[PDB]
Design a protein around this ligand. Structure first.
Ligand SMILES: *[C@@H]1O[C@H](CO)[C@@H](O[C@@H]2O[C@H](CO)[C@@H](O)[C@H](O)[C@H]2NC(C)=O)[C@H](O)[C@H]1NC(C)=O
Ligand SMILES: *[C@@H]1O[C@H](CO)[C@@H](O[C@@H]2O[C@H](CO)[C@@H](O)[C@H](O)[C@H]2NC(C)=O)[C@H](O)[C@H]1NC(C)=O
Ligand SMILES: *[C@@H]1O[C@H](CO)[C@@H](O[C@@H]2O[C@H](CO)[C@@H](O)[C@H](O)[C@H]2NC(C)=O)[C@H](O)[C@H]1NC(C)=O
Ligand SMILES: *[C@@H]1O[C@H](CO)[C@@H](O[C@@H]2O[C@H](CO)[C@@H](O)[C@H](O)[C@H]2NC(C)=O)[C@H](O)[C@H]1NC(C)=O
Ligand SMILES: *[C@@H]1O[C@H](CO)[C@@H](O)[C@H](O)[C@H]1NC(C)=O
Ligand SMILES: *[C@@H]1O[C@H](CO)[C@@H](O)[C@H](O)[C@H]1NC(C)=O
Ligand SMILES: *[C@@H]1O[C@H](CO)[C@@H](O)[C@H](O)[C@H]1NC(C)=O
Ligand SMILES: *[C@@H]1O[C@H](CO)[C@@H](O)[C@H](O)[C@H]1NC(C)=O
Ligand SMILES: *[C@@H]1O[C@H](CO)[C@@H](O)[C@H](O)[C@H]1NC(C)=O
Lengths: 234, 366, 49
């Protein structure tokens, strides 16, 4: 149940700097006050971030860093897949107050996928149909997320932080804890971002090498890019 | 003598072998387990569909305890074809499929690899390579009706047979002859489906029998569906072997005060050596210490002189010695545990250096 | 031909070049056999079709 829209809002994408954000815990192994070198798919430091202020379709590539600097739980929905229709197994995610809810099958979407708020909200008109599937899973502020998919396992790493800077990303460091794991394998090439009735940043990750520092409590406090510049390589 | 391959030994200290404390018992502690598959709705279902309309169910991502199914004696027929039922709780595949229906008592044997029949050719056909099990049981008191239960139908007429894992519910008027029929029965046109006449008064082999066939699937997705595991009792302060959630190894387990963030499961110190684990059941941080070991050594005054020796255990506390379990007055030193040589309070020069500033000589042995 | 036989159930395995000819009921399940197969007990020998 949906129709088209006339206010075809396409604000041109701006570009900004990533600084030192987008580090997540690689392993489930506790460590204490140690420097560990690891090769993994990370967001390279001081890279280009494609700032968005309708919603296009972006390639997923290997792994995607997604950030939303919102106020009081704005961001809700995510759509992932190769064809994003009833031809190929699609994936849908809705963030909820407690946790996230995930549906894995073929939903038929229109040009304007949106949730809708009624003024207490009750409106679910993002898609139109869903024939067959099995997998369903249920469990001011910048919310960061890292989405990855490796060998039949889709992983979502989450983080919430408070900030008062208005323009861009802050100059801070915070490791991204693992939140959700999925032992499911479906082909994904593209994804979108869902509207509600708002600026967000997107970044693309590459396989590189990093050095991490663990404090006495098993938390990451500092990271160094291996192959960025001579000092960091040393 | 065996080590030196000689019948005479000169005075001195010789390394012979090593002492290692053996394990005492095995402790396995797997997590709290959950997510049992819904078998109850299968074998306690209100009603099963027709044989040619056999109900298909998929089971995935849940623990499937086959012990309760196996030990139950309420099912007349329990025939597993692919593998033995006993080991099903050990090995498992990535999916399960259940085919539930009702047949006659005589048709029970028809559902097997290398079997043919009206059901096996017009209602449900299985491959000769089929692996799994079949569970059949009489339901005369339930499915059969005193007035004749015709709710169950079976395909009787069909031009061709049924392929394996194929369900057909077509109601096409079977045309045995060459005379076409426009949906109306005639001389050479009949109904392929016939209603069963299940009744309580019917004899053995005619009563309704509910049959559910279980098969196991190996799609390239990881295996997720099989029986639960076993959890032993945790012990402490004893050199034992453990299987904590797949992390297997030996050592002595004590209590630790270290802190884990709520998402790690186990830690390590350096060089990837497991040093602390959390029990997957009560969520507390334990600690692992290697079982004590160390080479043994022999101090002798020379085969020519005498024939009594002293034994040294390197870097082992004098708490666990064990024929040399008691011997003579045991002496404890920093270098290790010394057996057979009595301690004196005097001070002479050194004959056979022992370690940590202490050493022995021949008076007996001192 | 039903004159040829094979063992299918046993308590454990067998040593190399070791032949076992003990023809006894096998306690397949927890139910004791007590000389009768009944349930959880079956004859561990079978022929070839
Ligand atoms: C590591 O975690 C421990 C356990 O909480 C911290 O120790 C206490 O932490 C609380 C809250 O974080 C503080 O209110 C206490 O003052 C801390 N006490 C001590 C003695 O540290 C500890 O601060 C954390 N960080 C480090 C580096 O140990
Ligand atoms: C169908 O219902 C019966 C009766 O409730 C179940 O039999 C019980 O199974 C549990 C399994 O843990 C046992 O602990 C009980 O002792 C059983 N009771 C009786 C009277 O047999 C049966 O398990 C159900 N079917 C399935 C497939 O679960
Ligand atoms: C598995 O979960 C059960 C949930 O009940 C745990 O049982 C509780 O354990 C706590 C901590 O020891 C007790 O305070 C409760 O009284 C227990 N409730 C019961 C037994 O109903 C259990 O500890 C968990 N771990 C296992 C079983 O290994
Ligand atoms: C050898 O083992 C004995 C135990 O029989 C140790 O003595 C104990 O040591 C602990 C730790 O220092 C103390 O808390 C106990 O009070 C001691 N008990 C007794 C009876 O002495 C001894 O320390 C161990 N020696 C070595 C070198 O490891
Ligand atoms: C990103 O690239 C654009 C051109 O493609 C450039 O104008 C901009 O300065 C770049 N930003 C960063 C942070 O590198
Ligand atoms: C999150 O899910 C719970 C579980 O149904 C629900 O009670 C709660 O209202 C949800 N949060 C929302 C809708 O913001
Ligand atoms: C992805 O597509 C390839 C070929 O296009 C196929 O072999 C593979 O099974 C697919 N993986 C999925 C659907 O998870
Ligand atoms: C053994 O010791 C005695 C006394 O010192 C000596 O006479 C003899 O030669 C020794 N024999 C050997 C084989 O060392
Ligand atoms: C050494 O001195 C201690 C101190 O009391 C005494 O108990 C022990 O018997 C003495 N041993 C010898 C061999 O003199």
């Amino acid at each position: 149940q949906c129709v088209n829209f006339t206010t075809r809002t396409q604000l041109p994408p701006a570009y900004t700097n990533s600084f030192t954000r987008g580090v997540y815990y690689p392993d489930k192994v506790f460590r204490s006050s140690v420097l560990h070198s690891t090769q993994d798919l990370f967001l390279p430091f001081f890279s280009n971030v494609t700032w968005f202020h309708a919603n296009p379709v972006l390639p997923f590539n290997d792994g995607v860093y997604f950030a939303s600097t919102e106020k009081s739980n704005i961001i809700r929905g995510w759509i992932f897949g190769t064809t994003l229709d009833s031809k190929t197994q699609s994936l849908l995610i809705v963030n909820n107050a407690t946790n996230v809810v995930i549906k894995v099958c073929e939903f038929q979407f229109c040009n304007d996928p949106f949730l809708g708020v009624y003024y207490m909200e009750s409106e679910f008109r993002v898609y139109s149909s869903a024939n067959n599937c099995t997998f369903e899973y249920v469990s001011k502020n910048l919310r960061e997320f890292v989405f990855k998919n490796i060998d039949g396992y889709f992983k979502i790493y989450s983080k919430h932080t408070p900030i008062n800077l208005v323009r861009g990303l802050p100059q801070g460091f915070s490791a991204l804890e693992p939140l959700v794991d999925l032992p499911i394998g479906i082909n994904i090439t593209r994804f979108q971002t869902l509207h509600i009735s708002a600026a967000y940043y997107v970044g693309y990750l590459q396989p590189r090498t990093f050095l991490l520092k663990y404090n006495e409590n098993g938390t990451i406090t500092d990271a160094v890019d291996c192959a960025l510049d001579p000092l960091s390589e040393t | 003598k065996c080590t030196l391959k000689s019948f005479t030994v000169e005075k001195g200290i010789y390394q012979t072998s090593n002492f290692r404390v053996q394990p005492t018992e095995s402790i396995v502690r797997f997590p709290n387990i959950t997510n049992l598959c819904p078998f109850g709705e299968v074998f306690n279902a209100t009603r099963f569909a027709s044989v040619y309309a056999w109900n298909r169910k998929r089971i995935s991502n849940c623990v499937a305890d086959y012990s309760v199914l196996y030990n139950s004696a309420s099912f007349s027929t329990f025939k597993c074809y692919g593998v033995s039922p006993t080991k099903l709780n050990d090995l498992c595949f990535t999916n399960v499929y259940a085919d539930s229906f009702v047949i006659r008592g005589d048709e029970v044997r028809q559902i097997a690899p290398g079997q043919t029949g009206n059901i096996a050719d017009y209602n449900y056909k299985l491959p000769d390579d089929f692996t799994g099990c079949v569970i059949a049981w009489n339901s005369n008191n339930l499915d059969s009706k005193v007035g004749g239960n015709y709710n169950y139908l079976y395909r009787l007429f069909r031009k061709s047979n049924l392929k394996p894992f194929e369900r057909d519910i077509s109601t096409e008027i079977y045309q045995a002859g060459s005379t076409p029929c426009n949906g109306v029965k005639g001389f050479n046109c009949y109904f392929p489906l016939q209603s069963y006449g299940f009744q309580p008064t019917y004899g053995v082999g005619y009563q309704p029998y509910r049959v559910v066939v279980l098969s196991f699937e190996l799609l390239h997705a990881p295996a997720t569906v099989c029986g639960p595991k076993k959890s032993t009792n945790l012990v402490k302060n004893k050199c034992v072997n453990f299987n904590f959630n797949g992390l297997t190894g030996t050592g002595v387990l004590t209590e630790s005060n270290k802190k884990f963030l709520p998402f790690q499961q186990f830690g390590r110190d350096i060089a990837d050596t497991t040093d602390a684990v959390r029990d997957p059941q009560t969520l507390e941080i334990l600690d692992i210490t290697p079982c004590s070991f160390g080479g043994v050594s022999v101090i002798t005054p020379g085969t020519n002189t005498s024939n009594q020796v002293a034994v040294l255990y390197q870097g082992v506390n004098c708490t666990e010695v064990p024929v040399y379990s008691t011997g003579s007055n045991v002496f404890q030193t920093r270098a290790g545990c010394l057996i057979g040589a009595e301690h004196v309070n005097n001070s002479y020069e050194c004959d056979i250096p022992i370690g940590a500033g202490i050493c022995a000589s021949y008076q007996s042995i001192i």
